[PDB]
Design a protein around this nucleic acid. Structure first.
Ligand SMILES: [Mg+2]
Ligand SMILES: [Mg+2]
Ligand SMILES: [Mg+2]
Ligand SMILES: [Mg+2]
Ligand SMILES: [Mg+2]
Ligand SMILES: [Mg+2]
Ligand SMILES: [Mg+2]
Ligand SMILES: [Mg+2]
Ligand SMILES: [Mg+2]
Ligand SMILES: [Mg+2]
Ligand SMILES: [Mg+2]
Ligand SMILES: [Mg+2]
Ligand SMILES: [Mg+2]
Ligand SMILES: [Mg+2]
Ligand SMILES: [Mg+2]
Ligand SMILES: [Mg+2]
Ligand SMILES: [Mg+2]
Ligand SMILES: [Mg+2]
Ligand SMILES: [Mg+2]
Ligand SMILES: [Mg+2]
Ligand SMILES: [Mg+2]
Ligand SMILES: [Mg+2]
Ligand SMILES: [Mg+2]
Ligand SMILES: [Mg+2]
Ligand SMILES: [Mg+2]
Ligand SMILES: [Mg+2]
Ligand SMILES: [Mg+2]
Ligand SMILES: [Mg+2]
Ligand SMILES: [Mg+2]
Ligand SMILES: [Mg+2]
Ligand SMILES: [Mg+2]
Ligand SMILES: [Mg+2]
Ligand SMILES: [Mg+2]
Ligand SMILES: [Mg+2]
Ligand SMILES: [Mg+2]
Ligand SMILES: [Mg+2]
Ligand SMILES: [Mg+2]
Ligand SMILES: [Mg+2]
Ligand SMILES: [Mg+2]
Ligand SMILES: [Mg+2]
Ligand SMILES: [Mg+2]
Ligand SMILES: [Mg+2]
Ligand SMILES: [Mg+2]
Ligand SMILES: [Mg+2]
Ligand SMILES: [Mg+2]
Ligand SMILES: [Mg+2]
Ligand SMILES: [Mg+2]
Ligand SMILES: [Mg+2]
Ligand SMILES: [Mg+2]
Ligand SMILES: [Mg+2]
Ligand SMILES: [Mg+2]
Ligand SMILES: [Mg+2]
Ligand SMILES: [Mg+2]
Ligand SMILES: [Mg+2]
Ligand SMILES: [Mg+2]
Ligand SMILES: [Mg+2]
Ligand SMILES: [Mg+2]
Ligand SMILES: [Mg+2]
Ligand SMILES: [Mg+2]
Ligand SMILES: [Mg+2]
Ligand SMILES: [Mg+2]
Ligand SMILES: [Mg+2]
Ligand SMILES: [Mg+2]
Ligand SMILES: [Mg+2]
Ligand SMILES: [Mg+2]
Ligand SMILES: [Mg+2]
Ligand SMILES: [Mg+2]
Ligand SMILES: [Mg+2]
Ligand SMILES: [Mg+2]
Ligand SMILES: [Mg+2]
Ligand SMILES: [Mg+2]
Ligand SMILES: [Mg+2]
Ligand SMILES: [Mg+2]
Ligand SMILES: [Mg+2]
Ligand SMILES: [Mg+2]
Lengths: 64, 80, 96, 52
RNA sequence: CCAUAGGUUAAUGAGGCGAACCGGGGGAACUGAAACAUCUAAGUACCCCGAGGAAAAGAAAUCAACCGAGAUUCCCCCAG
RNA sequence: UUUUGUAUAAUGGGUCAGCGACUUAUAUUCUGUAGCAAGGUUAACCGAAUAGGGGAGCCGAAGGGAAACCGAGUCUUAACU
RNA sequence: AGGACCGAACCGACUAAUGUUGAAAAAUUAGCGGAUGACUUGUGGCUGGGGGUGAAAGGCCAAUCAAACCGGGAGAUAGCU
RNA sequence: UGUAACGGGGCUAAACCAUGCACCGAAGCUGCGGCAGCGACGCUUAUGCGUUGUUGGGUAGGGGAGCGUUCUGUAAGCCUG
RNA sequence: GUUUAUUAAAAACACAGCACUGUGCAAACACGAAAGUGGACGUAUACGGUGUGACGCCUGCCCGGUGCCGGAAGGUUAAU
RNA sequence: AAUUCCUUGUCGGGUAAGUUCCGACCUGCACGAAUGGCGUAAUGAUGGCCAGGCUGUCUCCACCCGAGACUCAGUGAAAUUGAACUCGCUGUGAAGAUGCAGUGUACCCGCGGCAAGACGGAAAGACCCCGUGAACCUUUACUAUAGCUUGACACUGAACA
RNA sequence: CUUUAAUGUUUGAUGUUCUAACGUUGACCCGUAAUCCGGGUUGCGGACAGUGUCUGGUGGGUAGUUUGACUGGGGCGGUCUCCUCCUAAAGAGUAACGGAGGAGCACGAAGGUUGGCUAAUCCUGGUCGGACAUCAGGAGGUUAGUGCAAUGGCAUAAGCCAGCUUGACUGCGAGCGUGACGGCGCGAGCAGGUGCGAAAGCAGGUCAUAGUGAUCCGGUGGUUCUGAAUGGAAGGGCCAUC
């Protein structure tokens, strides 16, 4: 049978041009008045998934 | 059976120290020293951070030197 | 994704975005695909007959990719700037 | 943690707000600061409102 | 009281068995979730009823999308 | 065999003969190999039929962005050195 | 007269020894208790498993009981050997 | 439990210190022969042929190359009273 | 008297008796999706449950807690 | 004390001597009045203690009678078992050696006996721990629920105040 | 309007009686040769009761499950995150149920800037006034101070006074540090707009290092980005925030 996609990771990650995965940063959902604006400003943009924890994503997202 | 304790704690190591030594070519913005106080002081082309972190404002080689009447340790970036 | 009982990455991390249904009915077209139609006119029904975009498609852009060497009338499609220049240089006529 | 949290609403008509804390016991009077409003790109008086 | 219930004759039919498939009435838990209760397993196993050589469904108070298609059933895609 | 470590007085086996344990299916990725090559390939089905037909579709040649959208650029931002 | 007395049948099972691959998957020998009573026994019948029954020990329900047996789910699961 | 606190016999050096020359002593090193791996170099590869260095303990484990068995084609062939 | 058939026969269980409490009969209660049945072909001097356990002398204080019974003015409070 | 830790409490009795027994005291760790209190004749295959009789229980065993054991003939098992050419000692060592080292001793093979060792046999330790194992049981653990109960609507209507 | 009368119906509540539903495990008759049942007459009760759906309460009567780890064995006890010093072996890092202490905040000024200032303690003298208030001089030279623990810093003060103020700004960010990762941190500089200062310049919170919590779900404001025939809308997305 077909492999089933882990649908949470499909809602959390997107494949880029060279095969990497982009993702949203954490720590930006609440408790936001005590955090510096520099920190948040460096948390709004999407970041790439690191090389170490990229294998578990590919295992969860076989269909890109 | 019996006993207890009150001395189990300790904190995490903050990884301070000197990251780039003398005669060591750096880029601008490179952290040289992380430290609590001003155990070192900022010389030429070297800024002092919020936490007394010494960073390079320019590119070049690190020069450690002792100046001033108090024999304080200054860090400068030589031109290159 | 099981990391022991540690919270895995796909649950540490937040969800984002939504899915556009309109993106499924849009398509992009090479300039090299313009020669594969017949008649030298390019519509949606022409491209679907040439088996390029697919049936359920309702929108298409032409993109500077590849190159065309023939005058082709483009009708009812969006065109990029470089494709507009290349079509008009090869003799095309972009219309609506 | 008696120092509750509030928001500083722009008086420029925008719904823009800064968030911050105060001790309402020791500072019963309202906070008014002149802060930057990035929508209007001006420094505008913000006033204390409830965090809601 | 008529009547009705009931009774009796007669005629025709049924009853029971049987492998799977089928439609329906009821309907688990182990398990998985690295525990577990929502969830899953699974309308599965099992029980029951009825039928046929197949059954069931079936001829739009349907889809579509402002173009149009034109009952049901089955297969490949759509698409994990 | 398990172990830091067994002649171990740790486990197991009386002996022989026979059987006895990483498979299968479908998806996916990588490597190798072969065919074609900016193209490659068909499934169901038809067909008397491992041919041929069938290109429905799938992957690839363009990406960025949550998205509209733009497009070899795009996003961010009022705008980027 | 008697849930009276002694004591065989009969019912039971307090002690010791034997035996413990037994004669016997609970018995034999020597003693022991009740022995007209809440006795005992024959035949047949009824109560069914989270259920029965129980002068109640978690006792008994076909040499099996803190939930019988058989078949099925079922190749349960086993981060253990 | 039995000498039982040089391994024993035994030793007044066959003990200790110092110095010295010998010799024994390993699967170490060298010699002779043989196999294989990886690199150089040249050939002119049958893509391997000389020379050349050097390497060759090995569990879990990774990689590479093979033997044999049963069955199918080759095979209405070949072997076989 | 009974009891752990198969390591425990006992001080354990039961017992007559005592007390509390429920029950007015289509009884309570119990087995049963229900119909029904037992109670009981009985009717409070009866039946069920609970505790104690012949007989003799006795059974003292506490209702704050937990239960149960009774109350219904007020507060709160569901579907609707 | 079927309850008393300290405790063999103290005193008395009984005995040559009595952590038990009996009777007292009360300082009841931590009795107590129907999860009954204190007494109680009779009974008990009941528990503890004492005495008389009796005796191989014992001092301390002796002899005898029989059934086996032993020998012959016939039939003929079993558990167990890596392989055995299966000594002692001291030491060593997966830390308690038939098997190693050193040394000592010992011709080969049976039979009857004993049972110190083979960490002997039997039963994948019942103790202990672990397992994100199980079962049963409890409760003011969680979530449900039968059952009991409340009210609304329906089956369910008419009058009068 | 405040303060209200007539009539009537729309109607609920509470009684009052009735009978026709319903009940009868009351009597009698018939089916019938029958203590079931049904039908019939009657009596009693009577819209109660009782059943169905909904609903609140009670509910170990029953069922499904949970009931942590470290641990010089387990339990008991203690601990579980963060900060500071030692252990830590002169870079970083480094364990134990090792030795000692703290944190789970505070501040609209205790922030920014400009300007200025410089302590502790003791000695002498001096009204109430005293070991110790305030005052004047001298020694001393930071033995003080730092919002709070410790360590490192601090005189150009980062310590203490006053003035003006909100940079406790928004978008970014070369380049580095630290982590397995998630993530955490430092940061010159650029654009916009601002404060102080004559100006150079400084300011993207506080001398630094603790003062904290992922995701999901959900709430609030803003934004047409999306909007399942179309136009809207709901809902979702994005930004801020709880
Ligand atoms: Mg948010
Ligand atoms: Mg966890
Ligand atoms: Mg096509
Ligand atoms: Mg389940
Ligand atoms: Mg599970
Ligand atoms: Mg039909
Ligand atoms: Mg039409
Ligand atoms: Mg083994
Ligand atoms: Mg072991
Ligand atoms: Mg190992
Ligand atoms: Mg071991
Ligand atoms: Mg060895
Ligand atoms: Mg041995
Ligand atoms: Mg062994
Ligand atoms: Mg073992
Ligand atoms: Mg064995
Ligand atoms: Mg594969
Ligand atoms: Mg290939
Ligand atoms: Mg770019
Ligand atoms: Mg008698
Ligand atoms: Mg006898
Ligand atoms: Mg008798
Ligand atoms: Mg018991
Ligand atoms: Mg039995
Ligand atoms: Mg059962
Ligand atoms: Mg069970
Ligand atoms: Mg199954
Ligand atoms: Mg199995
Ligand atoms: Mg000796
Ligand atoms: Mg010498
Ligand atoms: Mg030599
Ligand atoms: Mg040699
Ligand atoms: Mg060699
Ligand atoms: Mg050689
Ligand atoms: Mg070698
Ligand atoms: Mg090798
Ligand atoms: Mg018996
Ligand atoms: Mg009996
Ligand atoms: Mg017994
Ligand atoms: Mg017995
Ligand atoms: Mg009855
Ligand atoms: Mg009793
Ligand atoms: Mg009393
Ligand atoms: Mg009370
Ligand atoms: Mg009450
Ligand atoms: Mg006591
Ligand atoms: Mg005692
Ligand atoms: Mg005495
Ligand atoms: Mg005695
Ligand atoms: Mg006494
Ligand atoms: Mg008592
Ligand atoms: Mg009492
Ligand atoms: Mg009693
Ligand atoms: Mg008796
Ligand atoms: Mg013989
Ligand atoms: Mg045998
Ligand atoms: Mg030894
Ligand atoms: Mg012998
Ligand atoms: Mg022996
Ligand atoms: Mg013997
Ligand atoms: Mg043994
Ligand atoms: Mg075991
Ligand atoms: Mg339970
Ligand atoms: Mg379960
Ligand atoms: Mg533990
Ligand atoms: Mg311990
Ligand atoms: Mg160090
Ligand atoms: Mg070091
Ligand atoms: Mg300050
Ligand atoms: Mg100044
Ligand atoms: Mg003075
Ligand atoms: Mg501070
Ligand atoms: Mg969750
Ligand atoms: Mg719409
Ligand atoms: Mg729109």
């Amino acid at each position: 049978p077909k492999i089933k996609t882990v649908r949470g990771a499909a809602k959390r990650f997107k494949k880029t041009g060279k095969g990497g995965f982009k993702h949203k940063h954490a720590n930006l959902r609440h408790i936001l008045t005590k955090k510096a604006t520099k920190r948040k400003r460096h948390l709004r943009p999407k970041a790439m998934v690191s090389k170490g924890d990229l294998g578990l994503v590919i295992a969860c997202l076989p269909y890109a | 059976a019996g006993g207890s304790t009150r001395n189990g704690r300790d904190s995490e190591a903050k990884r301070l120290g000197v990251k780039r030594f003398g005669g060591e070519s750096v880029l601008a913005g490179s952290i040289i020293v992380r430290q609590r106080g001003t155990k070192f002081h900022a010389g030429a082309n070297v800024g002092c951070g919020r936490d007394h972190t010494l960073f390079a404002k320019a590119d070049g080689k690190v020069k450690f030197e002792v100046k001033g009447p108090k024999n304080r340790k200054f860090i400068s970036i030589e031109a290159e | 994704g099981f990391e022991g009982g540690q919270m895995p990455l796909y649950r540490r991390l937040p969800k984002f975005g939504f899915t556009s249904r309109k993106a499924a009915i849009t398509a992009e077209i090479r300039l090299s695909d313009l020669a594969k139609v017949e008649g030298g006119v390019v519509d949606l029904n022409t491209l679907k007959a040439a088996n390029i975009i697919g049936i359920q498609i309702e929108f298409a852009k032409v993109i500077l990719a590849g190159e065309v060497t023939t005058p082709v009338t483009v009708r009812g499609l969006r065109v990029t700037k470089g494709a507009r220049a290349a079509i008009e240089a090869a003799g095309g006529k972009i219309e609506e | 943690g008696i120092r509750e949290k509030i928001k500083l609403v722009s008086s420029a008509g925008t719904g823009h707000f800064y968030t911050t804390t105060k001790n309402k016991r020791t500072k019963p009077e309202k906070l008014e600061l002149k802060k930057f409003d990035p929508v209007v790109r001006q420094h505008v008086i913000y006033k204390e409102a409830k965090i809601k």
